[PDB]
Amino acid sequence: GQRGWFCGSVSQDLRQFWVAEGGTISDPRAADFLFSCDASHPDTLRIYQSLDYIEDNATVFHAYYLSAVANAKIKNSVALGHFILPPACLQKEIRRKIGSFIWEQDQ
Amino acid sequence: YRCSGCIAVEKSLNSRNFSKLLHSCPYQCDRHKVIVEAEDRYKSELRKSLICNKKILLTP
Ligand SMILES: [Zn+2]
């Protein structure tokens, strides 16, 4: 049983794969999996500013998680944590903080 | 190699369980330490926006 929704800005390919394979597939408003290929001004904002996101009851994953699984053997491997999709207002600083060298660590 | 989110392969893990998974995990990789701290900042500011606004008053 794996319910999952997709913001408007998601490739139909990814939605098709979700339909085709997984647990029992369903795609309601609330769901169990929150997928998106965007975090700027799509439907996804309605997650980020929900109380569930504030109270750690909602994590948005990048819908390319499904692409990674489709190009894996079946469903094995492909940990979710790699596809955490944070709010776009954070991403600029997340990249830099990760990319920076040890002699920099600017903050 | 143990590190939640990088070994997040087990079934039943989803968007409701995940945030609590990492927080509960004794050992976290740098990438997820960064993302978590970044997300906590965002969530803090939503809360502090609700409690501050510019008009909301604190009165019994
Ligand atoms: Zn990790």
Author numbering:
A (entry chain A): 4 to 110
B (entry chain B): 590 to 649
Give me lines lifted from the publication on this model:
To gain further insight into the telomere recruitment function of the TTM complex, we first characterized the interaction between TERB1 and TERB2 using bimolecular fluorescence complementation (BiFC) assay. TERB2NTD consists of a three-stranded β sheet (β1–β2–β3) at one end and six α helices that flank the β sheet and scatter at the periphery of the structure. TERB1T2BM is a helix–turn–helix (HtH) motif with a long tail that folds back to the middle turn between the two helices. Notably, Cys592 and Cys595 at the N-terminus of the tail together with Cys618 and His621 in the middle of the HtH motif chelate a Zn2+ ion, playing a key role in defining the overall shape of TERB1T2BM. TERB1T2BM adopts an extended conformation and packs against the concaved surface of TERB2NTD, burying ~1400 Å2 of surface area at the interface. The long helix H2 of TERB1T2BM fits into a large hydrophobic groove formed by helices α3 and α6 and loops L33 and L56 of TERB2NTD through extensive contacts involving a panel of hydrophobic residues at both sides of the interface. Helix H1 and the N-terminal tail of TERB1T2BM pack against a flat hydrophobic surface of TERB2NTD formed by the β sheet and helices α3 and α5. Most notably, a cluster of acidic and polar residues in TERB2NTD (Asp55, Glu58, Asp59, and Gln110) mediate a network of salt bridge and hydrogen-bonding interactions with positively charged residues in helices H1 and H2 of TERB1T2BM (Arg605, Arg629, Lys632, and Arg636), helping secure the HtH motif of TERB1T2BM on the surface of TERB2NTD.
TERB1 is a molecular scaffold that simultaneously interacts with TERB2 and shelterin subunit TRF1. Knockout of any components of the TERB1–TERB2–MAJIN (TTM) complex impairs the telomere–NE attachment and results in infertility in both male and female mice.
